[PDB]
Homo-oligomer: A and B are copies of this chain.
Amino acid sequence: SAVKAARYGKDNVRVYKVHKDEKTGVQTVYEMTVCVLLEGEIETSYTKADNSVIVATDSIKNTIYITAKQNPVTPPELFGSILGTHFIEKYNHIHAAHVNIVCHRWTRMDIDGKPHPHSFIRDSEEKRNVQVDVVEGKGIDIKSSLSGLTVLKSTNSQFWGFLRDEYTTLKETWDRILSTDVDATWQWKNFSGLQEVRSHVPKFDATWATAREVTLKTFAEDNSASVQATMYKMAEQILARQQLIETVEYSLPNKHYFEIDLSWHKGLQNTGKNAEVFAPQSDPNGLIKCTVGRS
């Protein structure tokens, strides 16, 4: 036997950081969940019980807290780059660091129409994420994403003209509910290292904003011919508004809402144009994916 691949590290590391403006008195909080997997010349840990090559995952944990203490944790793309760079620079035998981060929402509360200085709300379960790969000699590869963005439109969704054979029972429709949980990823041009990532720091928050904004507007205004069509239009626009993005990926479940025929009951009309009460279906669900790049 031979080790073909190996990676190890710490997962599910919860981290909070507060910023306190000594002057204004305004505090700002950040919470994330961090995962770090390292690769390098560590194969002997697996084959001969050579733990000398192992940076203890406990130590990786410590390093996450220490890096958060010594550096900004925002934008996450930057923090992840700093953290990954640490490991490959610090340990000679460590040649790759993968850093995955989930950013949790702590939105500042408005009390009596006024933003509160130190009170926050988890206004949604929607996350902002980053996946950062720091590879010795190959720079820094960064994928940014939003996920758990749950939406529904009650009309202006359609699905007709799909293939029909002996396996097909679905009726064509020109008016349906469309609901999904948006998972959108934008993949950045390779960065040569931390300097290049730092030089672009403003664009991360700005591109996240754009991705969210375009997603919501496109979803809301597109008289959708299908999930496929609608999601391409989102990816289209995002690519046109940020040149440093190479690809845009969408993964969208179709969270079906079924009509309920109640005509059996006192001639109740609840289908078609009379459709009012629907049965949300927990499973199964359509799953539609696409990666859009530049022509």
Of B2, B45, B59, B118, which is within 8 A of A154 by CB?
Answer: B118
Q: Which residues of B contact A287 (CB under 8 A)?
A: 8-11, 35, 37, 57
Interface residue? A106 (CB, 8 A): yes
Contact check, A280 vs B14: say whether CB atoms are below 8 A apart: yes
Contact check, B236 vs A163: say whether CB atoms are below 8 A apart: no
Interface residue? A201 (CB, 8 A): no
Query: Known contacts being A66-B167, A277-B16, A283-B282, is A294 close to B51, with CB within 8 Å?
Result: no
Contact check, A283 vs B228: say whether CB atoms are below 8 A apart: no
Interface residue? A265 (CB, 8 A): yes
CB A228 to nearest CB in B, in angstroms, measures 4
**Which residues of A (152-176) have their CB < 8 Å from a CB of B?**
152-156, 159-163, 165-170
Q: Which of A128-136, A192-200, A216-224 contacts B (4 or more CB under 8 A)?
A: A216-224
Per the bound structure, the CA–CA distance linking A141 and B35 in Å amounts to: 30
Contact check, B277 vs A65: say whether CB atoms are below 8 A apart: yes
Contact check, B161 vs A51: say whether CB atoms are below 8 A apart: yes
Interface residue? A291 (CB, 8 A): yes
Of B46, B59, B228, B254, which is within 8 A of A231 by CB?
Answer: B46
Residue interface bits A145-156, CB-to-B below 8 A is 1, else 0: 000011111111
Per the bound structure, the CA–CA distance linking A168 and B228 in Å amounts to: 40
Contact check, A226 vs B49: say whether CB atoms are below 8 A apart: yes
Per the bound structure, the CA–CA distance linking A275 and B4 in Å amounts to: 39
Interface residue? A127 (CB, 8 A): no
Residue interface bits A53-75, CB-to-B below 8 A is 1, else 0: 11111110111011011000000
Of B47, B51, B124, B262, which is within 8 A of A122 by CB?
Answer: B124
Contact check, B220 vs A116: say whether CB atoms are below 8 A apart: yes
Interface residue? A119 (CB, 8 A): yes
Contact check, A220 vs B66: say whether CB atoms are below 8 A apart: no
Query: Known contacts being A8-B286, A119-B220, A285-B12, is A276 close to B2, with CB within 8 Å?
Result: no
Contact check, B65 vs A260: say whether CB atoms are below 8 A apart: yes
Which residue in chain B gives the minimum CB-CB distance to A35? B287
Contact check, A232 vs B156: say whether CB atoms are below 8 A apart: no
Interface residue? A243 (CB, 8 A): no
Q: Which residues of B contact A209 (CB under 8 A)?
A: none
Interface pairs (6), CB distance under 8 Å: A1-B293, A8-B287, A45-B229, A46-B229, A57-B254, A57-B286
Known: A2-B292, A51-B225, A119-B219. 20 other contacts (CB 8 A): A1-B236, A2-B295, A3-B290, A8-B286, A15-B279, A16-B257, A27-B154, A45-B226, A51-B159, A51-B161, A52-B161, A54-B163, A55-B167, A56-B159, A57-B286, A58-B170, A58-B286, A69-B262, A121-B151, A124-B125
